Write a protein that binds this ligand. Structure first.
Ligand SMILES: O=C1Cc2cc(Nc3cc(Cl)ncc3Cl)ccc2N1
Ligand SMILES: O=C1Cc2cc(Nc3cc(Cl)ncc3Cl)ccc2N1
Ligand SMILES: [Cl-]
Ligand SMILES: [Cl-]
Lengths: 4, 122, 122, 4
C-alpha cells in the first residue's frame, strides 16, 4: 500500500 | 486522502484471465475465419476501440457472436486477445505484420505504436 | 519472449470503472440494506472471495440481484466497491471498523491486512 | 514497454  | 494497493490492477487482470481460461462468465464468441475465441465483452471493450464501439451499440451490445473482417488473421487475433488479458505481447519477426494489422483494425493504439517501432528498427 | 506494457492492467481497470460509472454492461445489483449498487460480476469475482464463490455457483451465477447479510453497512460496501474498480481505498478513522468488517465478509484479504495494520498503529 |  502507498500514498498515490 | 485514499491509500493505494500497487498490485491490485495486475491481480484483477490475472483473475479475469483465469476466468477466461476456465470459460467462466464469458459472454461472447469472436469468430475469425474458421476460428472461435470466447471472451468477456467488458475486457474486450476496455482494451479495444473497435470492441468499445461494437458493444456500446444498442443493437450489437446484445449479440453473443461477433464476426471479424475476413482479412483478419486468427493467430494475430489470438496474440492480441492474450495481450488484453495479460499485458504481455508475443511479438515475433514472423507475426509482427499480422499483429500490427490486427491491432490497427481492433484500435489498440499502444500495440500499433510498439509494432511501428520494432519494424522501424529492422 | 513476450514484451510487456507496464500501464496495461491499470488502463484496463480505469476503463472498467468508466463502464461502471456510465452503467454500461453492468449485469448485477448488489443490495445492501436499502441501498443498491450496480456492478460487473467478473470484476466482483476478480476482487472478492465471496463473489467468486457466488458467481461460480451453477444456480447463483444466473441471478441479477444479490442481497448481502443485513449486518453489512452500505458505506463500507461503497468504499470497497470503489476500491475494486480503482485500487484506491478511502480508509478513515470513522469508517475503518465498517470497512474491515465488510472486507472480511467479502473475503478481500489485502484490505483486511491494511485495516488490521492501521487499527494496530492507533 | 519492458522485458518482463
Ligand atoms: O487504443 C485504444 C484502447 C481503447 C479502449 C477503449 N475503451 C473505453 C474507453 C473509454 Cl473512454 N471508456 C470506456 C472504455 Cl471500455 C476505447 C478506445 C480505445 N483505443
Ligand atoms: O482476497 C481475495 C480476493 C479474491 C479473488 C478471487 N477470485 C478469483 C480467484 C481465482 Cl484463483 N481465479 C479467478 C478468480 Cl475471479 C478468489 C478469492 C479471493 N480472495
Ligand atoms: Cl493497446
Ligand atoms: Cl483485497
Amino acid at each position: 500500500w502507498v500514498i498515490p | 486522502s485514499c491509500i493505494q494497493f500497487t498490485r491490485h490492477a495486475s491481480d484483477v487482470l490475472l483473475n479475469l484471465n483465469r476466468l477466461r481460461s476456465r470459460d467462466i462468465l464469458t459472454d461472447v464468441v469472436i469468430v475469425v475465419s474458421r476460428e472461435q475465441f470466447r471472451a468477456h465483452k467488458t475486457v474486450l471493450m476496455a482494451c479495444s476501440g473497435l470492441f468499445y464501439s461494437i458493444f456500446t451499440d444498442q443493437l450489437k451490445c446484445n449479440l453473443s457472436v461477433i464476426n471479424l473482417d475476413p482479412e483478419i488473421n486468427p493467430e494475430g487475433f489470438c496474440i492480441l486477445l492474450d495481450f488484453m488479458y495479460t499485458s504481455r505481447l508475443n511479438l515475433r519477426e514472423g507475426n509482427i505484420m499480422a499483429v500490427m494489422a490486427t491491432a490497427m483494425y481492433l484500435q489498440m493504439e499502444h500495440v500499433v505504436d510498439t509494432c511501428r517501432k520494432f519494424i522501424k528498427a529492422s
